[PDB]
Amino acid sequence: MDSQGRKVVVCDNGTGFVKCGYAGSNFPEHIFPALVGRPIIRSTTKVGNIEIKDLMVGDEASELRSMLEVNYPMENGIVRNWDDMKHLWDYTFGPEKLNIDTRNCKILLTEPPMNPTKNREKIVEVMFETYQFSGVYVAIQAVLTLYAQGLLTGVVVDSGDGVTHICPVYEGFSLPHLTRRLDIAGRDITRYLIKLLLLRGYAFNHSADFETVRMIKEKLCYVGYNIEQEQKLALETTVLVESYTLPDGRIIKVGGERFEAPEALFQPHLINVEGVGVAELLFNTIQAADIDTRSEFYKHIVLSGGSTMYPGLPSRLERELKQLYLERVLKGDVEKLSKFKIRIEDPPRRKHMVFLGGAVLADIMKDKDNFWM
Amino acid sequence: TTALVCDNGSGLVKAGFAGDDAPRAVFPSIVGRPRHQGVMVGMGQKDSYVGDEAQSKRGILTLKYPIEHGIITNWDDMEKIWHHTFYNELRVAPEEHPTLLTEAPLNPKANREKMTQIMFETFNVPAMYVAIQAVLSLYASGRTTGIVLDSGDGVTHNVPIYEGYALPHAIMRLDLAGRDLTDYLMKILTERGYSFVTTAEREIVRDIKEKLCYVALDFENEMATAASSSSLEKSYELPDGQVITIGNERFRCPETLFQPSFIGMESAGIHETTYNSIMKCDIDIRKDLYANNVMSGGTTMYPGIADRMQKEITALAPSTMKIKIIAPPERKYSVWIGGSILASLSTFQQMWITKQEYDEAGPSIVHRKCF
Amino acid sequence: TTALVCDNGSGLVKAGFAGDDAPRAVFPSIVGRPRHQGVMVGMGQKDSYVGDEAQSKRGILTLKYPIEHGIITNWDDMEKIWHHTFYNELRVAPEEHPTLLTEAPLNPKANREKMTQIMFETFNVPAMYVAIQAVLSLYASGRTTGIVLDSGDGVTHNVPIYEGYALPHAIMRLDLAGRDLTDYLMKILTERGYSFVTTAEREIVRDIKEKLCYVALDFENEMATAASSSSLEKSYELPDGQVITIGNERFRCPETLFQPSFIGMESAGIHETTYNSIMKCDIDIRKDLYANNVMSGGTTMYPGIADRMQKEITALAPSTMKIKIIAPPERKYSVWIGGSILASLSTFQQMWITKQEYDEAGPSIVHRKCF
Ligand SMILES: Nc1ncnc2c1ncn2[C@@H]1O[C@H](COP(=O)(O)OP(=O)(O)O)[C@@H](O)[C@H]1O
Ligand SMILES: Nc1ncnc2c1ncn2[C@@H]1O[C@H](COP(=O)(O)OP(=O)(O)O)[C@@H](O)[C@H]1O
Numbered sequence A: 001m002d003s004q005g006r007k008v009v010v011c012d013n014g015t016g017f018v019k020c021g022y023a024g025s026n027f028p029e030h031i032f033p034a035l036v037g038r039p040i041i042r043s044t045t046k047v048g049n050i051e052i053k054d055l056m057v058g059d060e061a062s063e064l065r066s067m068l069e070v071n072y073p074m075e076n077g078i079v080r081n082w083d084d085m086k087h088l089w090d091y092t093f094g095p096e097k098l099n100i101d102t103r104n105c106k107i108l109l110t111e112p113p114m115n116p117t118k119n120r121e122k123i124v125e126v127m128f129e130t131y132q133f134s135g136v137y138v139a140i141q142a143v144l145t146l147y148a149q150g151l152l153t154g155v156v157v158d159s160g161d162g163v164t165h166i167c168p169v170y171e172g173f174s175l176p177h178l179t180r181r182l183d184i185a186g187r188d189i190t191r192y193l194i195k196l197l198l199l200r201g202y203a204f205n206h207s208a209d210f211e212t213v214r215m216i217k218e219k220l221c222y223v224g225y226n227i228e229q230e231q232k233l234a235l236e237t238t239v240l241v242e243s244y245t246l247p248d249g250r251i252i253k254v255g256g257e258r259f260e261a262p263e264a265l266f267q268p269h270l271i272n273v274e275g276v277g278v279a280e281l282l283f284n285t286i287q288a289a290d291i292d293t294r295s296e297f298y299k300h301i302v303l304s305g306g307s308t309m310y311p312g313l314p315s316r317l318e319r320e321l322k323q324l325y326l327e328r329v330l331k332g333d334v335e336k337l338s339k340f341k342i343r344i345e346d347p348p349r350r351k352h353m354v355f356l357g358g359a360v361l362a363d364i365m366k367d368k369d370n371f372w373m
Numbered sequence B, C: 001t002t003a004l005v006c007d008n009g010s011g012l013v014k015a016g017f018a019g020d021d022a023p024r025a026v027f028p029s030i031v032g033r034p035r036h037q038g039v040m041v042g043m044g045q046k047d048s049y050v051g052d053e054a055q056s057k058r059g060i061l062t063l064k065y066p067i068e069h070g071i072i073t074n075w076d077d078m079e080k081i082w083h084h085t086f087y088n089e090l091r092v093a094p095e096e097h098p099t100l101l102t103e104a105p106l107n108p109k110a111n112r113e114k115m116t117q118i119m120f121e122t123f124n125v126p127a128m129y130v131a132i133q134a135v136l137s138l139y140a141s142g143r144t145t146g147i148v149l150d151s152g153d154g155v156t157h158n159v160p161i162y163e164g165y166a167l168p169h170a171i172m173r174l175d176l177a178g179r180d181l182t183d184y185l186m187k188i189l190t191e192r193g194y195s196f197v198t199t200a201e202r203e204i205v206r207d208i209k210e211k212l213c214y215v216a217l218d219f220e221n222e223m224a225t226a227a228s229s230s231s232l233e234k235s236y237e238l239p240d241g242q243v244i245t246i247g248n249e250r251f252r253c254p255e256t257l258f259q260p261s262f263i264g265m266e267s268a269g270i271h272e273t274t275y276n277s278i279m280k281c282d283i284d285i286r287k288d289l290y291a292n293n294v295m296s297g298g299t300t301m302y303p304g305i306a307d308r309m310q311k312e313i314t315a316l317a318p319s320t321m322k323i324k325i326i327a328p329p330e331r332k333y334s335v336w337i338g339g340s341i342l343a344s345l346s347t348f349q350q351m352w353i354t355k356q357e358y359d360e361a362g363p364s365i366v367h368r369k370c371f
């Protein structure tokens, strides 16, 4: 912490989850969803004795969502409802949760790359025009991964809730032109899972329902390692079928949808998106890099963001890269592939915007923070 | 006290102490400027990387050479190379140590003057001397007669010497040398579809040339065989593991030395150029300039290049006298070894340039001690 | 009897009968295959659209271009384009008509050989020839000497010519052209909050490149003035009726040609490339090339490109030389009009690869007869 005793905070401003903690903490103290919402009377629900404020925000708006019409202020990394966005931060720093409650302590911001410039600039306005912060910085979202991982060279794969990014960094140099986006992220996988359950005859349609299929997604879904083996095991045997309990207690059952939904990351054509799956977009990025740098990117693939948590994703991802390298570099000279040293950093800790390297290793007291000006 | 010996070649700098048998440091004469913005703390970036530090990191660095065709063209890089030479490779304080430098012949006098100035005016050397690269090779090969053939990365030059006396009027120089054979290889590889482009890749094309190319003993016969047999095709493995197959290209590259028309210039090949030099010398000494044809420099390392020379010179010379190329194993460092001899010898100390004389007379002194 | 002139460049295919003044047909070299399952049995038959159908149906098609950087990459799709060219677009069957194809320099020879094999085996043409695209552009001008600059969709290259002699060593090429300028526009529009990502939408971003972008005569003045006011903020309609409007993105894309470091390539821009090629030419040619820069190809259509290029070379070249830039009004068709002139030429009627010569030598004949 500062020699002035000031504290420093990180907000990921995540499109789905705000994630907050003090500088140097190995954990966030508070994880909560970015929902903001208003009370709505619904026929299908008994109105409780629990008091509902005229604006619920954050974790409270998630548990009481059954009474609430909920918005996300952030979509695909761009603020799309600026008033709820203000109210989400006004909740974050208030007496509740991360009670700094003050101008004096510093905040780090994380912006996605290739972000429409006005989005960045309005944040830098309100941080100094409303909270009147004493210290602010906006960091390249990709580099924070490598700071936390303790690396300087590697290609960062960063699938959040809103958008997926790939960003190479080579020995600390930013290579910008090798940036890529893929418009598949945790939100689209959720909507696609809604459709897959609709075929199985469960209807979900309320905004309060979106959180429920997210909780389904997080607990039952996984990425197929050999997609042919998953399909045969679904066709031949019943074991993939598993139960879940909805809020009203309906004991719904879900089957091969557990893997058919996450697979969209490798097959964007299952959703409407026309492109290439995460593995092939990652491979084309490395192949575009200058020829000597490729040798290191294959050894330092680095994973970030909650949509990378799906069981088996590192294993599936490694398979597609090995097969791509066999097909297109070794030109099918199969036995040579024993020489292809490839490695994926997939550390089980993977809310990978932790703050240690970005704050305390960058300043205890310094002229780097932007300041009131 | 011990002198330093330094061969400031375009291509590879070679430096070491006098009286040692081989250079103590060899490193590429490249200064790299990072072409991308750094973003990380703890990176340790700086305004430039040099030598092995640059070669080993070129995926970020726009490599440029300071020396073009044997002329120093950017003193603000060359000063950094010399700085790297003394303090990082040899780890020596220069003000203690006099130094023998090298130059090619027919090099513009402004280059030699600025070079001697930088030595006294910034590194504060006690004393120094400038020797012609060719001349040192006869020291290395231990003899006092021969037409020296020396070919670096940036110059090919020929210097007939007899009875210890040089014949300046018969000096012949060509700018076709190792780098133009690298660009040529980089051009012709486009025929097989390898699009090597930009400076960080040119160093890879060099690594192919430095390992797969060879000199044909009968060019059109090798062409006909390459056009009909895969025996001459070889394969090389790129840094990402993409293998490539090379053939016909392998010998069509260094053939350029014997047919400079391949790179578009109408000067005669090195064989005709060496023969011209002999035929321009005095009649009596020709009979043993056809012996003692001493090769030097890394561009003479190609397999068979000694033999192709012997064949073609024999086809040009009268048959009643005998050609014999001299081609040491050490020839890549022969120039430096020749300096390592010369700087160690007695009878050289009284003919350094010394800082007292330099400040008295200025850099125009080089034309009155050196050759 | 009559020859066919067929500029199978990347981007837009151009074909027509020799001697005609402008192409009979031009259409995009794209093959469009359906990205949804074909399910309306009946009219919805076609499994692969080519050309103007694919360009039109693009909403449902994954368009792809079978020529990448001037190198043909999918030969089955390329065959469909030629088949479309002869039987559907020209409506003349190939068996009676010799074909003039044309190609960029330093392409892999395998491209030239297979293109010929397809011509004799599949379309069964009487004879054919493969001119280099640059000299065709020089013919169209009615010009005996000049330095040609073709800037296609996929390749930009300089070829200097004097008295109709070519200078192969001075040929130089850059793989940056109208495609990568479009892909860069398809990034920088995201800075403003649009998003184009599908292959069909890349056709819309090309369209806006043609209509709104221009080369800055003074880029840093243009940047500073663009920040002052909406005076540049031109507006354009998407097919959906969404309206987009653009500021400094108008010139930042064209500027990539002069500062390739925007797309991260290390090569110099087209101005410094042009001057570098003249410096490779023989010295007495140079004065006459400065008076006869001839621009060609669609990428040279941007407003002000002739003036900007003149300014850059005038600064870079010796101040006594009179730099002028030949930018014909019709220069988009210059390559095809040049072919139409060559295929009419009474001397050229000997130069064809005639069928029996391929029947003798196989595909390798192209390296004997063609330039
Ligand atoms: N264990 C898990 N398995 C699968 N998905 C998860 C898991 N944990 C979180 N997610 C998903 O990851 C997304 C949130 O990730 P996060 O990194 O917080 O995105 P952002 O930081 O951009 O808000 C949500 O879609 C959430 O459902
Ligand atoms: N084994 C080899 N085969 C072919 N060419 C070589 C080989 N080794 C080096 N070369 C070429 O010979 C050149 C010689 O340059 P160098 O010897 O440094 O010149 P100088 O005589 O000025 O020191 C090298 O730059 C390289 O291009």
Ligand SMILES: Nc1ncnc2c1ncn2[C@@H]1O[C@H](COP(=O)(O)OP(=O)(O)O)[C@@H](O)[C@H]1O
Binding pocket: C007, C009, C010, C011, C012, C013, C151, C152, C153, C154, C178, C179, C206, C209, C210, C211, C297, C298, C299, C301, C302, C332, C335
């Ligand atoms: N004003 C313009 N009119 C037409 N095409 C233009 C214009 N400006 C730029 N272009 C671009 O020029 C390219 C067409 O060049 P093309 O004729 O294909 O060259 P080549 O056929 O030699 O490859 C396309 O990318 C097109 O967008």
Ligand SMILES: [Mg+2]
Binding pocket: A012, A014, A015, A160, A161, A305
């Ligand atoms: Mg996130």
Ligand SMILES: [Mg+2]
Binding pocket: B007, B008, B009, B102, B133, B152, B335
């Ligand atoms: Mg040397």
Ligand SMILES: [Mg+2]
Binding pocket: C009, C133, C150, C151, C152, C296, C297, C298, C335
């Ligand atoms: Mg063209």
